[PDB]
Amino acid sequence: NPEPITMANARYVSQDVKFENLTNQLPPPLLN
Amino acid sequence: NPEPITMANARYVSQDVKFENLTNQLPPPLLN
Numbered sequence: 001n002p003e004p005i006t007m008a009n010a011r012y013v014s015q016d017v018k019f020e021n022l023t024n025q026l027p028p029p030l031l032n
Numbered sequence: 033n034p035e036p037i038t039m040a041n042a043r044y045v046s047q048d049v050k051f052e053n054l055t056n057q058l059p060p061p062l063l064n
């Protein structure tokens with residue numbers, strides 16, 4: 001059941017090269 | 033031991049119909 005990525009389902013983690021380098025349409029936890 | 037609600041004891045969760053809808057004297061996590 002796709003839901004918006006918010007702080008309720010995301011935690012901050014360190015940099016990993018296997019992650020995704022989002023450049024546009026970022027989720028709220030990755031803004032400002 | 034009643035203590036103020038803060039990030040030390042409050043964890044963000046998704047919306048649910050069984051939670052209290054608050055309008056006055058909000059905890060700091062729910063402000064702004």
Ligand SMILES: *[C@@H]1O[C@H](CO)[C@@H](O[C@@H]2O[C@H](CO)[C@@H](O)[C@H](O)[C@H]2NC(C)=O)[C@H](O)[C@H]1NC(C)=O
Nearest residue numbers: 013014015016017018019020021022023024030
């Ligand atoms: C996201 O960007 C980082 C850094 O720009 C990429 O990490 C690089 O990965 C290549 C291939 O393994 C390495 O040769 C580089 O040394 C890495 N750079 C750094 C700074 O560690 C990463 O691959 C990118 N991820 C995606 C999915 O594109």
Ligand SMILES: *[C@@H]1O[C@H](CO)[C@@H](O)[C@H](O)[C@H]1NC(C)=O
Nearest residue numbers: 047048049050051052053054
């Ligand atoms: C809180 O508000 C939502 C939306 O109006 C409602 O569905 C829910 O029953 C309410 N819950 C309480 C405890 O007031």
